[PDB]
Write an enzyme that holds these catalytic residues in place. Structure first.
Site, PDB file in Angstrom:
ATOM      1  N   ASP A  37      23.676   0.538 -23.388  1.00  0.00           N
ATOM      2  CA  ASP A  37      23.441   1.823 -22.757  1.00  0.00           C
ATOM      3  C   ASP A  37      21.946   2.040 -22.525  1.00  0.00           C
ATOM      4  O   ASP A  37      21.185   2.216 -23.472  1.00  0.00           O
ATOM      5  CB  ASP A  37      24.021   2.931 -23.629  1.00  0.00           C
ATOM      6  CG  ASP A  37      24.197   4.232 -22.880  1.00  0.00           C
ATOM      7  OD1 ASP A  37      23.180   4.818 -22.437  1.00  0.00           O
ATOM      8  OD2 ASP A  37      25.361   4.671 -22.730  1.00  0.00           O
ATOM      9  N   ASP A 128      23.708   2.205 -15.632  1.00  0.00           N
ATOM     10  CA  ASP A 128      23.084   2.254 -16.943  1.00  0.00           C
ATOM     11  C   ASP A 128      23.931   1.828 -18.140  1.00  0.00           C
ATOM     12  O   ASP A 128      23.496   1.949 -19.283  1.00  0.00           O
ATOM     13  CB  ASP A 128      22.508   3.653 -17.200  1.00  0.00           C
ATOM     14  CG  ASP A 128      23.546   4.760 -17.067  1.00  0.00           C
ATOM     15  OD1 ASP A 128      23.160   5.942 -17.156  1.00  0.00           O
ATOM     16  OD2 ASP A 128      24.740   4.464 -16.869  1.00  0.00           O
ATOM     17  N   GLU A 129      25.140   1.339 -17.905  1.00  0.00           N
ATOM     18  CA  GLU A 129      25.951   0.887 -19.028  1.00  0.00           C
ATOM     19  C   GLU A 129      26.794  -0.342 -18.720  1.00  0.00           C
ATOM     20  O   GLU A 129      27.177  -0.587 -17.577  1.00  0.00           O
ATOM     21  CB  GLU A 129      26.828   2.024 -19.582  1.00  0.00           C
ATOM     22  CG  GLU A 129      27.770   2.668 -18.602  1.00  0.00           C
ATOM     23  CD  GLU A 129      28.828   3.503 -19.295  1.00  0.00           C
ATOM     24  OE1 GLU A 129      29.508   4.288 -18.596  1.00  0.00           O
ATOM     25  OE2 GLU A 129      28.988   3.362 -20.531  1.00  0.00           O
TER      26      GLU A 129
END
Length: 409
Positions: A37, A128-129
């Site tokens: 993350d 973002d993950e």
């Protein structure tokens, strides 16, 4: 009003506990899933490109709706999906910066390039993950030497000792006072073979390439992993070991609100039944199979049992690590006995021949060639990708410690 009979609730229990048993008997703990993350990604990006924001509360979005809040802003309670006027009430000085996804996509790609090294079949959930199954990477890293887990740390005019250290050797010591390529390297760091070390290597590479930090979670499955990375949030990482006890210990009283997967609405209904922790989620499993959708209580059961996906099939590669090689002749014939090491046929041969190199300071550089196309070899493409490398700082020779070739289209 009608009620659920302290009978029919029993039939349920039997049906549920029959499914619970069939689930307990098949839980895999043999896989190591990682959830990555990027810390307040969008915002951290803006903060990077515009240093004026580094020490302030900011958020990406607009007044109508916020998307990403940096951690300074989060301390005030500012969150994504929060209206701007509410954020401004919580934090008057908040600087709302308009999104620019092309800059976020690019940085993300950079991150992806790194995540692919550890699991070419990783799952990118968003920019973002991501989820990675490092199981296979671990089985291999197990036998890897230090030079295959060594990376150039970023700290070029540094006082590092070179070959003049030879005067301290037995044969030059006493003589120096009787008289009448410096081999100076640049710093690099090493990570171990364990899962925690692997994830530290990943986070390190990301921060070194992007300037950004990321958090992560390590666990037997996808669900646990997600919750995990959230634990030591900003730039931390937490792992749950492959034993049932650690799994159940972590799941004990774990607030339902911390279990991403359960919707806000479902959480609301659960509250009305007085259900918060995952333990209570297990206790009231019989009543839940009767009240919620099949899809929802199935999920509930898995959560309460700390179960989730244990899996989330591009490359055929070789790679050799060695003591410094800088003479072109040596570099080519090696590329040849390497392209030949690609005897691993099973279907000399086809599309994208990506090259991999590591210099004497353990700086990584990968270069390929989207493509070549068919007609009536590996090397022929490796030579060229390698040649244009020897010719780069063309006057200075290429100082290598690592060379690798990988087919991919």
């Amino acid at each position: 009003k009608a009620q659920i009979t302290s009978q029919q609730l029993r039939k349920a229990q039997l049906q549920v506990d029959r499914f619970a048993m069939e689930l307990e008997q098949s839980r895999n703990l043999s896989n190591t899933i990682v959830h990555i993350d990027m810390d307040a990604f969008y915002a951290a990006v803006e903060m990077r490109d515009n240093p004026e924001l580094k020490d302030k509360p900011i958020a990406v979005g607009s007044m109508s709706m916020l998307s990403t809040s940096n951690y300074h802003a989060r301390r005030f309670g500012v969150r994504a999906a929060m209206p701007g006027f509410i954020a401004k009430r919580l934090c008057p000085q908040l600087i709302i910066v308009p999104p620019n996804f092309d800059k976020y996509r690019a940085v993300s790609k950079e991150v992806k390039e790194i995540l692919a090294d550890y699991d070419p079949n990783f799952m990118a959930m968003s920019l973002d993950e991501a989820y990675l199954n490092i199981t296979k990477h671990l089985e291999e890293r197990q036998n890897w030497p230090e030079d295959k887990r060594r990376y150039f740390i970023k700290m070029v005019e540094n006082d590092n000792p070179g070959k003049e250290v030879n005067k301290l050797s037995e044969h030059e010591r006493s003589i120096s006072p009787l008289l009448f390529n410096p081999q100076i390297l640049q710093n690099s760091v090493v990570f171990g073979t364990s899962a925690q070390e692997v994830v530290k290597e990943i986070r390190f590479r990301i921060e070194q390439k992007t300037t950004l930090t990321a958090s992560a979670g390590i666990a037997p499955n996808t669900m646990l992993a997600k919750v995990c990375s959230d634990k030591n949030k900003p730039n931390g990482q937490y792992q749950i070991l492959p034993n049932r006890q650690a799994v159940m210990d972590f799941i004990k009283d774990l607030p339902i609100r911390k279990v991403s997967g359960i919707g806000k609405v479902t959480e609301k209904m659960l509250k009305a039944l007085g259900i918060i922790t995952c333990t209570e989620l297990y206790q009231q499993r019989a009543l839940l199979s009767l009240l919620f959708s099949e899809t929802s209580w199935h999920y509930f059961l898995h959560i309460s049992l700390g179960l989730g996906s244990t899996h989330l099939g591009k490359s055929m590669s070789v790679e050799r690590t060695f003591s410094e090689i800088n003479k072109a002749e040596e570099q080519y014939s090696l590329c040849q006995e390497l392209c030949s090491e690609l005897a691993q046929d099973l279907q000399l041969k086809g599309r994208t021949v990506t090259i991999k190199l590591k210099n004497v300071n353990f700086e990584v550089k990968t270069r390929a060639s989207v493509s070549s196309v068919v007609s009536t070899e590996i090397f022929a493409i490796a030579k060229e990708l390698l040649k244009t490398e020897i010719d780069a700082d063309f006057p200075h020779p290429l100082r290598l410690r690592l060379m690798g070739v990988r087919i991919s289209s």
